[PDB]
Design a protein around this ligand. Structure first.
Ligand code: NAG
Ligand code: NAG
Lengths: 49, 50
């Protein structure tokens, strides 16, 4: 499949190189991010007029 | 200015020969490359790496 033929001759042939498949998907992000204190807005004791 | 060497001056004549009376063995050197490194390249992993 690299020589694009059906016969090959006595020798060594540099085909493609081998590399195991990269499969998964990693998305890591610093968890240092903290939730904005919206509780002070929604759970406020009294809303303005 | 580059100096091409010590100007010598040879005394030609028409009835004078100059025959050496002694000799000298002189191991010189000469250095020659023969082969260079044998590289190779795979297209897909150079251009389209992963
Ligand atoms: C060498 O050259 C000179 C100049 O021409 C000449 O007079 C002389 O005869 C020559 N020598 C011989 C041996 O002929
Ligand atoms: C020739 O030269 C060598 C060194 O260059 C020296 O030892 C030797 O005596 C010389 N021979 C003569 C006949 O001049």
């Amino acid at each position: 499949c690299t020589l694009k033929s059906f016969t090959v001759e006595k020798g060594i042939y540099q085909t493609s190189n081998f590399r195991v498949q990269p499969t998964e998907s990693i998305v890591r992000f610093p968890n240092i991010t903290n939730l904005c204190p919206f509780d002070e807005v929604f759970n406020a004791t009294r809303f303005a007029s | 200015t580059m100096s091409l060497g010590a100007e010598n001056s040879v005394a030609y004549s028409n009835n004078s020969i100059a025959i050496p009376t002694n000799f000298t063995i002189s191991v010189t050197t000469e250095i020659l490359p023969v082969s260079m490194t044998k590289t190779s390249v795979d297209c897909t992993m150079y251009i389209c790496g992963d």
